[PDB]
Enzyme design. Structure first.
Site, mmCIF file in Angstrom:
data_model
loop_
_atom_site.group_PDB
_atom_site.id
_atom_site.type_symbol
_atom_site.label_atom_id
_atom_site.label_comp_id
_atom_site.label_asym_id
_atom_site.label_seq_id
_atom_site.Cartn_x
_atom_site.Cartn_y
_atom_site.Cartn_z
ATOM 1 N N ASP A 170 0.839 -1.196 0.000
ATOM 2 C CA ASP A 170 0.000 0.000 0.000
ATOM 3 C C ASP A 170 0.876 1.249 0.000
ATOM 4 O OD1 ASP A 170 -1.921 1.904 0.251
ATOM 5 O OD2 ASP A 170 -2.449 1.419 2.339
ATOM 6 N N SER A 179 -0.377 15.480 -12.160
ATOM 7 C CA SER A 179 -0.597 15.109 -13.548
ATOM 8 C C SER A 179 -0.832 16.361 -14.378
ATOM 9 C CB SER A 179 -1.795 14.167 -13.635
ATOM 10 O OG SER A 179 -2.181 13.922 -14.968
#
Length: 330
Positions: A35, A199
Site C-alpha cells: 500500500d 498530472s
C-alpha cells in the site's frame, strides 16, 4: 541488495493485490496488500480477536525465534474507506522477494474492522508511503522500504501491476525489460506523507488532451481512480446510459457498454488506461448495472491514482534524497 516478488489480484476484478511476505524465523509467509498510500506493516496475528479472523493466515510471534516485543508500542489506523485496525508491535525479520530487513516493526492486530475480517485473502498490509505517516506510538517506526533503502543497489521500488493477471514489485533496481519507451519522472511532494504528484491533464477516448494540473497520490492500496468531478463527468458523458447513483455510491453504467479509454499526463508523456480496465462489473450479482472504475474524489479531499491508473503503467517510486515518481507505458 535487491528483491523481486510477484503480486497477484485477489479476485477477478483486481479489487486488490497480494504479495507473499516472509516474517520471522522460521519464516511465516503471509499475503500482504502493498500500500503506497499508508506506512504501517500490520498483520493478522495470534493476538487478533478470534471472532474477527475468518480464513486469514496469522503471524504468531511466539513461534518466531527472532521476534521481540517492542515494549509499550501500540498502533491504530483508519483508512479512507472507513476500515481500521489496531494492536501492539513486535520487531522481527521480514523478507520480500529475497530482500531481508532485520528489526522491522511488525504491527500485530488485536482488532480489525469488519471489511478486513470479511476479506479472507488479505493477511495484512505493507505500507510503502513515507514513514512520517506511520502510526506507532510513542516511537514512530520506519517502513520496510525505509529500512531497506540504504542496503539497496538503488533507493527505489517499482510497481508493475497486472490487469486481470499477476505483476511484480521490485526493490532496488529498475527492470528495463518491463516497460516500453522511456520512463518519465515527475516531482513528488512529501508534505502529506504520500507519493503526491501533479498530472498534466487528461483525455477521454480519442478526444483531445486537456492540459490541466491534477494533484494526486500514487496509491497501490486504492482500487479505483478518483479524480475531480469535472474530469469524471467528462469521462462518463461519453458512455450512453452512465449516471452517478447516490444509492450505489458512484458512477454506474450499462454492462452492455464498451468503455472508452482514459489518458492521463505525466509531464509531456501520456499513460493510456484501456476502457476495459474501467469496468468493475455488476453492482450486485446478476445486475445489468456495472460499477465504474473512475469515480469522483469530491468527497475524499484528495485525488487518488489507484490501481486502475497504476496498472496501466510501470511505476517507479524513487526514494532518493529528493523523491520522484516515474511512469512508463508497458
Amino acid at each position: 541488495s535487491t528483491g523481486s516478488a510477484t503480486t497477484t489480484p485477489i479476485d477477478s476484478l483486481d479489487d486488490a493485490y497480494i504479495t507473499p511476505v516472509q516474517i520471522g524465523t522460521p519464516a511465516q509467509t503471509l499475503n500482504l496488500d502493498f500500500d503506497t498510500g499508508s506506512s504501517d506493516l500490520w498483520v493478522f496475528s495470534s493476538e487478533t480477536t478470534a471472532s474477527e479472523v475468518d480464513g486469514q493466515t496469522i503471524y504468531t510471534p511466539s513461534k518466531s525465534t527472532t521476534a521481540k516485543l517492542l515494549s509499550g508500542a501500540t498502533w491504530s489506523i483508519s483508512y479512507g474507506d472507513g476500515s481500521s485496525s489496531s494492536g501492539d508491535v513486535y520487531t522481527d525479520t521480514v523478507s520480500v522477494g529475497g530482500l531481508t530487513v532485520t528489526g522491522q516493526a511488525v504491527e500485530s492486530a488485536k482488532k480489525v474492522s469488519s471489511s478486513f475480517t470479511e476479506d479472507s485473502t488479505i493477511d495484512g498490509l505493507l505500507g510503502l508511503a513515507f514513514s512520517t505517516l506511520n502510526t506507532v506510538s510513542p516511537t514512530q517506526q520506519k517502513t520496510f522500504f525505509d529500512n531497506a533503502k540504504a542496503s539497496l543497489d538503488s533507493p527505489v521500488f517499482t510497481a508493475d501491476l497486472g490487469y486481470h493477471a499477476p505483476g511484480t514489485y521490485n526493490f532496488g533496481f529498475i527492470d528495463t525489460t518491463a516497460y516500453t519507451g522511456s520512463i518519465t519522472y515527475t516531482a513528488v511532494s512529501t508534505k502529506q506523507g504520500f507519493w503526491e504528484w501533479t498530472s498534466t491533464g487528461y483525455a477521454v477516448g480519442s478526444g483531445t488532451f486537456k492540459s490541466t494540473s491534477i494533484d494526486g497520490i500514487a496509491d497501490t492500496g486504492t482500487t479505483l481512480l478518483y479524480l475531480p468531478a469535472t474530469v469524471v463527468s467528462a469521462y462518463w458523458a461519453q458512455v450512453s446510459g452512465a449516471k452517478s447513483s447516490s444509492s450505489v455510491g458512484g458512477y454506474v453504467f450499462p454492462c452492455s457498454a464498451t468503455l472508452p479509454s482514459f489518458t492521463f499526463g505525466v509531464g509531456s508523456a501520456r499513460i493510456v488506461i484501456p476502457g476495459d480496465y474501467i469496468d468493475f462489473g455488476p453492482i450486485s450479482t446478476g445486475s445489468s448495472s456495472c460499477f465504474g472504475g473512475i469515480q469522483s474524489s469530491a468527497g475524499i479531499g484528495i485525488n487518488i491514482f489507484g490501481d486502475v491508473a497504476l496498472k496501466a503503467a510501470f511505476v517507479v517510486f524513487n526514494g532518493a534524497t529528493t523523491p520522484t515518481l516515474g511512469f512508463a507505458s508497458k
